[PDB]
Amino acid sequence: GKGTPSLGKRHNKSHTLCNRCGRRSFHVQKKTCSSCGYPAAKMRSHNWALKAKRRRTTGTGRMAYLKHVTRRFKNGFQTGVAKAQT
Amino acid sequence: AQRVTYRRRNPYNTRSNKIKVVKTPGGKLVAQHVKKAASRVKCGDCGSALAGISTLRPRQYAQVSKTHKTVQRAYGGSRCANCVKERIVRAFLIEEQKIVKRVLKEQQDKEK
Amino acid sequence: GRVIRNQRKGAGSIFTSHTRLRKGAAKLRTLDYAERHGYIRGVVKQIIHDPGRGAPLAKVAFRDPYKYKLREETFIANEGVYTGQFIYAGKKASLNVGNILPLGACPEGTIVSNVEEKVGDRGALGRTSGNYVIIIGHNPDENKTRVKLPSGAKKIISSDARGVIGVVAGGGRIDKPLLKAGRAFHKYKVKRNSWPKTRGVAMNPVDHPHGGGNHQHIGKASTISRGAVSGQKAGLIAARRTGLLRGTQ
Amino acid sequence: PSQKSFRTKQKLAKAQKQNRPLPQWIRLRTDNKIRYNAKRRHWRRTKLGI
RNA sequence: GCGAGAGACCGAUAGCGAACAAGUACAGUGAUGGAAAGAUGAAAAGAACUUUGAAAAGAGAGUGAAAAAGUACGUGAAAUUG
RNA sequence: AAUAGGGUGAAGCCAGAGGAAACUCUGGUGGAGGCUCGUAGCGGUUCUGACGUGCAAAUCGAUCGUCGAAUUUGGGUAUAGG
RNA sequence: UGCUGUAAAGCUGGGUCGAACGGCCUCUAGUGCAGAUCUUGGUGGUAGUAGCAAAUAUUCAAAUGAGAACUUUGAAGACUGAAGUGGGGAAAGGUUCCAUGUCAACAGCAGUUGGACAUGGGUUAGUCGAUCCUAAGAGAUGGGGAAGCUCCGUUUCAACGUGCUUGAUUUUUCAGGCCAACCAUCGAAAGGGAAUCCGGUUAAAAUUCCGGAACUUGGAUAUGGAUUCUUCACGGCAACGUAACUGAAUGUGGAGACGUCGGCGUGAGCCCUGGGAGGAGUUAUCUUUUCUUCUUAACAGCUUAUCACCCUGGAAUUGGUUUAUCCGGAGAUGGGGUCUUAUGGCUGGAAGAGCGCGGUAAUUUUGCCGCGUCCGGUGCGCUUACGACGGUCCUUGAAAAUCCACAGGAAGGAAUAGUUUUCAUGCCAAGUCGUACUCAUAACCGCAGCAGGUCUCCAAGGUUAACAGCCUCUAGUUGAUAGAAUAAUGUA
RNA sequence: UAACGAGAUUCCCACUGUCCCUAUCUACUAUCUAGCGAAACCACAGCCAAGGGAACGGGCUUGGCAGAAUCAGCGGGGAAAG
RNA sequence: AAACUUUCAACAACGGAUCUCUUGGUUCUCGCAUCGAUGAAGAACGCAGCGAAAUGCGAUACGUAAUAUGAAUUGCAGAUAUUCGUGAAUCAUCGAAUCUUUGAACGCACAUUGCGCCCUCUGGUAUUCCGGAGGGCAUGCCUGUUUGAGCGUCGUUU
Ligand SMILES: [Zn+2]
């Protein structure tokens, strides 16, 4: 009875959603995320999992602030406002 | 016969989920949720139930009048009548004996 | 092989003691000025059952010498102690059952229980039901007392060590057979997870040094050296002799 | 279940709003390649895993 | 990473897993795993209208250089079938 | 949190009878037990039954074990790959 | 369509097609397939075959519709048979809910039907939960290890209060006076816990909305009562009583707060039953007949009890007494009392509601009128709650938040005025999140609308020891591809 | 070694289709129809005898023979499939 | 003889090979040096006249300002939109801003949209209670300021 009969007793989640990565990998009893390592300060990442770095890394999200660092760098990190041409 | 259902999300026959079946003015046999029974106040010396004191769930003693919670006597709502009587007799007799054991001593401390 | 059942107990996962229903640690009072120089009187309020313990416990109320307060102490009830009895503890206490006295203050042959090995450890020796310590003798000039332990061992203790006069209550408990696996189950339900015990000779070689074979047998000597290592000490450890005990020892 | 958390209910609200067919005027745009919503979900077929 | 220029490189089962809403759909409790999927036409001009049908459709007609290009869309092989 | 209905009839107790006593006997009462028959439940003996590209990657039917405790079970919690 | 070459192959006629491509001299390589139980994709034979057979069972008509074994309605026949195929929930799901429309795909036949598809609508709280407490445990800090990721430890070898209480002061300063045993925090939608009931209402919500009737907590605060010239009340021999009727630090205690079994007692709901007031059924015959309505919530006041306790009295000829033999000079029987209010009664709530009939309204949104809604009985009955007991264990069967009482005597208090929100009445507020539906032979997990698995509440009549089995009522279904025959072999 | 045992074994009584020795009956299949509609397996295929042969042939050699298309069963063979 | 079986051709199917393309990849070369407590990378949830995704953005939400430019956007619709002009559209450029809930994530906590405390203003007859708006309250370490502790210790007065 380890097949179909035992598969009918699965109604207690081991994992819930993680606050840092939102993945349903936060272990409820251990209070740890198996995906990002929350609540550790560092993100969980390994060199033996290179495809896993592809899934979650810089550029897979919005890059809302790093988008414009090259644009600001190219102008020498200006301050002030643009002038109206005479 | 009409059959009843719990009125709350708790579906288990727990100590806090006891129900009475009550017929309402609408001709309906419903379940009435029953609060846990209160225990009697007990004596601090012998552990017997104190007389003249209301039986209420702890929080209910806050909004009830004072004469419900006490008796007009020393240790009124705390010790029973017999226990207070025992303390009074014991206190009087022992302190009287302390006199006797002392005045005897000055009888003993000036002849030897 | 595999980590055997001896070694799994040290981790203490499922092998910790079940302590929900225990009524506190049974200790003497902390040694203080009143006990060191005079005596202090308390009263026995309750004589209660401690689960997992064959001896009853006595709650004894004392007064605090330095602040207005009542201090409750948990003693092991000596047999003959009753509720409302006055307990006297200190150097000047009289030789009465249930009183707490320093060992030097007791004559030879005094029967004492819950005796301290060290001054102020609050009781170590003779704490199970029906057990007691006999004060064999005094060697006053180095302040020592020779006592006889429940196992027959003779020990030398500081005379400042304290003990409770009398025998621990609940004695004779072993005289009745348990008769039932259920009785033992209930006995260890409130102690720890050490029952029932599978014989090592009934296991496989992974599980025990005694396991395996086409017949259940130990195979090698079941007497194990004291210098053996964990995973080997299964059997009779450092046995000086074996077999049925014939004669005196 | 009936007793749910606000965080759970906020995820279920988004799951419904995403479960609509393609609006038709989008098929009429120039250089349009989308023919239908390919991320439809039926409650009995695929679970949300929330 | 940012920005450029190239090649005796590959040409949609190849080349990055991904030429497409691809680390997407989906699976797994989880760590992780992980696809398929390009091409009407120059231009939708994507078939008005009539007729049979409950409708889908069909037959006419029409558009178009072509409908032996009708979105089940360039060509349209073989197995297999009428 | 859950566990029909019966059988048997332990201590304790009442009354009577016998006896020099020590004691014995009889009838009730009582309601013990990891007692017993037996539902729900939990298990899975036999048919080596059905099925065996199944209803099912272990089920179905009859038969069976046990059924007040070393009982059954929900939730929480602990123990993690030599 | 042929031609050329031994061949690898090359060239050509015809048809289709629509944008690039070849010969020759050299260069270069991811360069030649029949196989690898090869890889990916596609397609066959098998084959219109195996099969679509558990869960008693369907039939007639009408409507709708292009079309009806399968949709709806009616009539019937059935079944689940209260340990249900009923009515709810916890976990899990997540819009499956409800209306309108609709049938390409799905519902292994069908389909006008649907948990499908499309468009909308829908979840209302001071009182129900979460929120708070602590449990097993988890886990920061001070520290101590470890190269380090981090490990131990949980008050620990620590100078550990984001302390309180008043008098204030307005001088936005202070005056002080008491602490600091323990105490970060997290951990229960079944443990603990402040407080809500009835009737009505939607397509779909309701202990949340409407109508009415309450309650709790926090705060403000006035009036009346109470009390004081014997300053902080009186009465009772007492158990104790009452509308009230000072009380800081600190301390003591109680409640929270607890196994299991057995029989007994009481209540409640149901079951049973008599009269009467109504309605329905049967009536060849019989039947003062068979069925059905006659109900009363939370809350408020008064009363009401086993046990317990008090006063009197002094008991062997021992008495009282339980189904169960325990009690009495440590004071029985007797007499008289006090208490808990569990539980019942009465009254208010409240008949104005609901229910049952009758008579009228009318497209009618929605009704309006009248009458009744009464009085009992019974029990080794069933379930359940409580009580007093008894048994049992080498088993003695959580904690904390929280609330109260008591002890104590700090401080403050009147007389022409003082005190108190533990007496009554009055005023204000009660945030956040959840709330639809399924809970299963189709809403969960088993790749699926799978005979499996998945916690619990309520429970009618007859037969019976029985909550078994069998038949029936309320409620719910009539779902499982059908038709015609009835060889062999099967399965039961 | 009393009691207990879904433990193993022998005998006796009762009982019986286990058997002599089978027969009959019922429901659901199978059968036929409408709708729906797979899979294993598949070098090519499918009549025998003898011979020789990798020493047990569907095919080769020599004989017997040999007539479309098929349905229900069946379990000798395909040294059947897994 | 039909039917059936098999083979072939034409036509039609099934299927997606071949052929030709190609806003993609791959490799090599060249140049550059620029994430974050002034809150990053990532996540969640939202935002359009009619949008599910992708792309963009944050309650100022397919974007605001500024500079440049110079008539569009487009599937449809519609201006209290515009055309010799501070003027359509524009991530063209970009130096000023906005930037929900989070996240190193910082008042405490977190499977909760839980629980505080401080300052200013404000509503309710309120320093204390309830509500609202704004601003705040993490840790290690450094420099300094202030208040302190210790017979650690110095000078004086008994
Ligand atoms: Zn995470």
Asked if omega into C51 is within 30° of 0 (cis), the reply is no
Dihedral sign, CA of C47, C50, C55, C59?
Answer: negative
Determine phi and psi for A67, rounding to 5 degrees.
-50, -45
A17 at D interface, C-beta within 8 A: yes
A52 at D interface, C-beta within 8 A: no
Q: For residues C111 and A1, what is the distance between their CA atoms, to the nearest angstrom?
A: 63
DSSP C175: G
Chain A residues lying within 8 Å of D7, measured CB to CB: 17
Residues C196 and C24 sit within 8 Å (Cβ to Cβ): no
Q: For residues C100 and C163, what is the distance between their CA atoms, to the nearest angstrom?
A: 5
**Residues that constitute the known binding site of A for Zn(2+):** 18, 21, 33, 36
Q: After which residues is chain C broken (C to N over 2.5 A)?
A: none
Chain D nearest C-alpha distance from A84 (Å) = 38
Q: Which residues on neighbouring strands pair with residue C164, listed in sequence order?
A: C100, C113
Q: Considering only residues 24-43 of chain D, list those whose CB is below 7 Å from strand E.
A: 30, 33-39, 41
Look up tokens 């799994």; give the residue. C8
DSSP C223: E
Residues C125 and C149 sit within 8 Å (Cβ to Cβ): yes
Nucleotides of G under 7 A from a protein CB: 82, 86-96, 115-119, 128-129, 135-139, 149-150, 189-200, 207, 216-218, 233-236, 238-246, 250-258, 268-271, 293-298, 307-310, 338-342, 350-351, 353-355, 385-387, 393-398, 401-407, 422-424, 433-439, 443-450, 452-460
Chain D nearest C-alpha distance from A24 (Å) = 7
Q: In the numeric block, which tokens belong to residue A21? A: 């990565």
Q: Cβ of C147: how many Cβ atoms within 10 Å? A: 24
DSSP C42: E
The distance (Å) linking the CA of C96 with the C1' of G162 is 55
Q: Which of C158, C141, C139, C157 is nearest to C149 (CA)?
A: C157
Residues B50 and B42 sit within 8 Å (Cβ to Cβ): yes
Dihedral sign, CA of B76, B81, B87, B93?
Answer: positive
The three-class DSSP label of residue D16 is helix
C198-206 LR contacts (CB < 8 Å, sep 24+): C200/C4, C200/C234, C205/C1, C206/C1, C206/C2
State this model's resolution in angstroms: 2.6
Paired sense of beta strands C236-237 and C223-224, if any: parallel
A28 at D interface, C-beta within 8 A: no
Determine phi and psi for C135, rounding to 5 degrees.
-85, 100
Q: For residues C162 and C123, what is the distance between their CA atoms, to the nearest angstrom?
A: 8
Q: What angle do CA C113, C118, C120 make, to 5 degrees?
A: 85
The three-class DSSP label of residue C243 is coil
Paired sense of beta strands C133-139 and C144-148, if any: antiparallel
Chain A residues lying within 8 Å of D11, measured CB to CB: 17
Q: In the numeric block, which tokens belong to residue D5? A: 């958390």
Q: For residues C241 and B12, what is the distance between their CA atoms, to the nearest angstrom?
A: 61
The distance (Å) linking the CA of D21 with the C1' of G115 is 20
